[PDB]
Subunit: 428 residues, 4 copies
């Protein structure tokens, strides 16, 4: 449209405001009618359920912003949606909508996915403060109710707290996204669109788990065991740990995954191939011995995110008074050794600003390893579904090519293209 | 008006949104042209500056609520405003307005005062969730920007956090108030308008200071020394300390103030009349706390900012906390927490304690809006105990009880321990 | 001994100091050679393994205190010890002794049990400050190494932290106990010997779990779900929740257990009988009932089989404290450090909290006391008389006791499960 | 003596144990008779009060350790003591002794000073665990009562907590020191005696104030304003801030002091020089503007040790002032507990933080070193050799020392103010 052409030309705010908002737009989405299609199936191929096509543009609520999405990224919640697992997302959309008012727009026969993105503001509701058409933004997933009392103690704790594009519609894997003003932050000027896009969900989550006072809250000198360290979450967890003056010990399962974590500066590396009932107890003793060997003590904090076997082990190997922080699901390993387990996901608007400030300074860098065009977004989802990636897989949306969107080139030069892209061209 | 009549009659939501909003309303307020009137004056008599008259009704922003105010209260920020101290509130209003957009409405030649209240919702902006016309509400004063990151970590810490009716316009000492929806909580059903109205600010403030994890965070068994315990803050502080299993020790400056403090179940009472001089007075105070309570205080609760603040620092136990709004600091490893107000989360927690009757209102007097200036003066001259309420649109006392069975179970006497009490 | 008589007649400091220390003392104990006696045995009857007899008086270490034990209590760890489950305690004693030095003494062919007690100091080591013979004390179980850096941030967190009479020898189910000076607090004067001895382990455990900043850290207004509320841990938990202005909700499995919990001031009560993939559904019905009774989902779930249920029912951002896409916390805890035990002791001293004592046996009958706990026939706490010849002794503040009331102090007298 | 000869030549544990303890030792000390000597004197030259001479060797308490001191350092409390200001330390030594028992030894007509040190264990009390003659230690100043409940929640918070060599006798500025075993940590092997000795007091202090959960507790990204950045505290403050991913902003008052701070990796620097309580508000205004220009926002933590009022003003809403308007926290702190000291020691052991040593004096010239600190001529820390006859000794892991490099470990060598 004239609007996308104006955004891509980087036109003035008055030009953007003058260009008309189109009636529909191109979006990676699911269809309600397909919710049951994988009923019998062992391998729920994500490419079978995913559609790319025109969906209707919704009316903007007063506290919402319409964002022309330049790039987005694949997340695991995207893979789960497309699998319809473990409950199809249309159930979440109906729940959302039972609130009434503006929330009823979320209940549609279609669901636009995508929980991250970078882009350009094109419209704001009349209750939106500061943001204007033309502004470069990042969007993080915490879609919350600022009227709820719990939100004012912790953005993540509200009963209405939702993940954008997973439990809400109008997500990022599209030409346009609809978001609350409290999901928006200024784009780090020195990054490309795709670079900026891959961070908010994964880096924010890791930040909450590790740095923030609402998580493990590490300190310099802590030893941190990081499971699945070469993936999206582990890639930022390694970086926050080094930056904080901690000592990361990564667990990987392959030569290539080992190479990825070394690229992020994790030199203490354990290969899962030594080992991974009574065998869980034993394996834990093996693991604990290796951490002491490599780092000097048992870990102070264990970081885990599969929710599989690694969770039980985490509890075993954490030091007495240690903390396990987790995402995804012998009593004496808990109470006898006085340990703590912190269940965490996402991050509130304050934490995401803190995470952003760390990218704005270059203290932390994006974990982008691959870029797919929006026309190939289904295959990028499959690649994440089959664990063929290290770090993050970005998707160009409205951006017609890679390398666009840098508005502080001098800074980018100072920091270094390669420093900024440690995982470029790497896979699993 | 037909709107006020509809509200006062207990009409349906339909009836309320059918009744037109008036273009002016009656409000206790200050005039910009008067900000210099106490230049040179010793007694800055609030009755000289405070005006009661009609003021233009503003347009409602998307996230705002027009509240028909039933009852309000006098707070010390109200007194300070009327004194144009320490800076005229008009400087805060112009700073507010520099944000632009909807904030420009706050910069007027008039300032409608009032920082808490109870009332009935009459209009809501198109971005307001859940609230509807006819809903019984309380308003607390945390007027904050929900778009700011810091707000989602602690409502009080945003750059744009303001005290309603002090750093914003359209406060509660008026027939109507304009509030952000994140200032609203359901009214406790068993309370009258005036009872409900006296708490949010002072009780909220003490909650954050004493109970919340953002303040001193008392535990059962803590000894808490409470300066100026008979006033608005201390009345609620005594309640939170007892409710949580703590041991309150009150400081008062008269027999009638002692009576008020005893009325709230504080039985350990110290009179000021018992007293480099500061260092000596401090050791005297610490001796008395050990006599009465068994150890030095764990937390000291301070709020005049006068001599009590140096003393607090002295008498707090090693590793202790002074909450307020040289070797005694670092050698004894003490903590000072500066605080005021309360965020929307703390205010809800405070509301739930009033809702179950675990704590009760500290209302001691009630004035009609026609006499609100004299009520302000009573507070300025410290002739009150607890809280002074102001009836706004409520035409008499005792209205607004919508849970009479609960009220009767708690005891109307139990709900009003400070009834009829004064400081003189 | 002339020592036991002097203590009982309430003699002087000098008189206790003049009376010699016998070379053996009477003690409830296990034998290392018995460790295998229950092999292939389903009911591990503790009456079969518990011995009552003479054991020799060990040498006193510099930082230790010899306590003439007036009363003790039964705790879960005594039962487990007497079953030799899951590992015999003789393995623990041996691990202790490996330190060398003074720890060597713990490695014995016998094991004197007992983790709480009350009594009278009779000897102090040359490195012990303040305490002198004649002093009335309670003893709590935290036997810690004050040389470890960890101990100086949190007494429970040292690698050498051990439970007295479980992982150490010379426990409190005997006429005397040897403790480290940092296990000692003054006895609440208004209480009898048996009343004071029931609390330290269980009330300190609950204090850390609920009150302390090292646990879930309740505030007034919190809804706290308490599993197994009529037992020893649960009896103090209810009391701390109520005293801190919280709202307790108790789960019980019988009508007499509901009786014990209501005696302690818990008016919101849930029977375990009101009620794979069925864990989630059972979660939903438990959560519905808590909202029905208390008004909201619980802020804290106090757990000690039901761990997974506790995780389901806690609110978003809630806490599950346990002793054996959500935002929940789980805190594993046992014991209490010396600081938390002193804070606990002060709540008993003011009468804000009362002992959970329900029954009393002489030391002659402690194996039966141990069986009662083993078979879950108690509510609250079972006391054992050690050197005290009768109940009712050791009150040294009569006017406070009359004021608080013997009744109020004994809400669980004679009750059973 | 033959003991000191054995220590210096590297004799075995049993050889140390066998060489007798001398009756007197050489110590830097104050005399009680001199306590009025500066009446009406403005410049209380510490070189007039300080004596170096033989003093009697005390009896060793069961929980104590005798240390042959290889090196020590000057601290502000040493200066203050030698000035008898504001109160003669002899008044602390009497208050201490008032506890009785083993504390009586502290009340003497002399007072040996020195609050940190490194050296070699020579004797242990019968209650001391693990340590052996021959072991290389550092000593930190937290002299604490391990029996008091508070110690077990936080080592610094007990009523009996004292500064070694300042509120206790038998300090580090002598050939021997007497310490509690709870003051000892293993010596970082790659360091010299003198390098290891300068850190424990100041580095532990800054650790508590900034890294620990008992102080300001910085996170990566925090902007920290550091007043008087070039001194002993500020030198370690800068290091911890950088190592924790924080952004330090140093305030210095001369170009030489600016040189010291940049040698420690602080790139953001403000000169004091740049300019009623309305004047402190105005000075606050310009300060805050300078921090925003250099760092990007107002400071999250102000590290303060005249400037207190300014620190309160410049802190952000919700910010912290840590010290040794409407929503701010002020944390008073000094020292570090035994746990914080070990965490501090661990960052030295890895090379993450380096000693802040700027100069070395022999014990013979220690009064001169004290005058240097009294007159603020120093940057960082001044070390004193005690039993070590020369510099460069005491490294026992020279491979790590080579990896890290002598210059990296000594960024402030040869510098002054």
């Amino acid at each position: 449209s004239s609007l996308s052409r104006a955004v891509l030309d980087g036109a003035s705010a008055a030009e953007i405001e003058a260009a008309p908002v189109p009636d529909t737009y191109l979006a990676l989405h699911l269809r309600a009618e397909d919710a049951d299609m994988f009923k019998g199936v062992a391998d729920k191929d994500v490419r079978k359920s995913l559609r790319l096509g025109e969906v209707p543009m919704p009316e903007l609520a007063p506290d919402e912003v319409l964002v022309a999405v330049m790039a987005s990224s694949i997340n695991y919640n995207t893979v789960w949606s497309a699998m319809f697992e473990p409950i199809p997302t249309f159930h979440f959309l109906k729940q959302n909508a039972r609130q009434g008012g503006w929330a009823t727009r979320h209940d549609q026969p279609y669901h636009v996915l995508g929980s991250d993105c970078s882009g350009v503001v094109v419209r704001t509701g009349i209750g939106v403060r500061r943001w204007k058409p033309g502004d470069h933004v990042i969007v993080h997933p915490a879609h919350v109710d600022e009227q709820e009392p719990a939100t004012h103690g912790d953005g993540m704790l509200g009963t209405e707290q939702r993940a954008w594009g997973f439990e809400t519609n109008f997500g990022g894997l599209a030409e346009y996204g609809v978001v609350r003003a409290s999901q928006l932050l200024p784009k780090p000027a020195h990054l490309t669109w795709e670079e900026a896009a891959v961070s908010p969900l994964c880096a924010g989550t890791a930040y909450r788990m590790l740095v923030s006072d609402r998580g493990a809250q590490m300190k310099q000198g802590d030893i941190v065991l990081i499971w699945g360290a070469s993936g999206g979450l582990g890639s930022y967890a390694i970086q926050f740990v080094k930056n904080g003056g901690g000592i990361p010990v990564a667990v990987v399962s392959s030569a290539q995954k080992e190479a990825a974590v070394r690229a992020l500066g994790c030199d203490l590396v354990i290969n899962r191939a030594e080992l991974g009932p009574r065998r869980v107890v034993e394996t834990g003793r093996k693991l604990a011995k290796l951490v002491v060997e490599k780092a000097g003590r048992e870990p102070d904090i264990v970081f885990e995110h599969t929710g599989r076997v690694t969770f039980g082990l985490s509890v075993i190997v954490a030091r007495r008074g240690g903390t396990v922080v987790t995402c995804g699901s012998d009593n004496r390993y808990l109470w006898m050794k006085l340990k703590k387990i912190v269940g965490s996901h996402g991050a509130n608007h304050e934490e995401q600003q803190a995470t952003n400030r760390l990218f704005e300074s270059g203290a932390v860098v994006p974990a982008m390893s691959a870029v797919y065009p929006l026309a190939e977004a289904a295959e990028a989802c499959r690649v994440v579904q089959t664990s063929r990636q290290v770090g993050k897989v970005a998707v160009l949306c409205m951006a017609p090519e890679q390398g666009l969107g840098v508005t502080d080139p001098d800074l980018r030069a100072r920091l270094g293209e390669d420093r900024l892209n440690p995982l470029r061209g790497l896979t699993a």
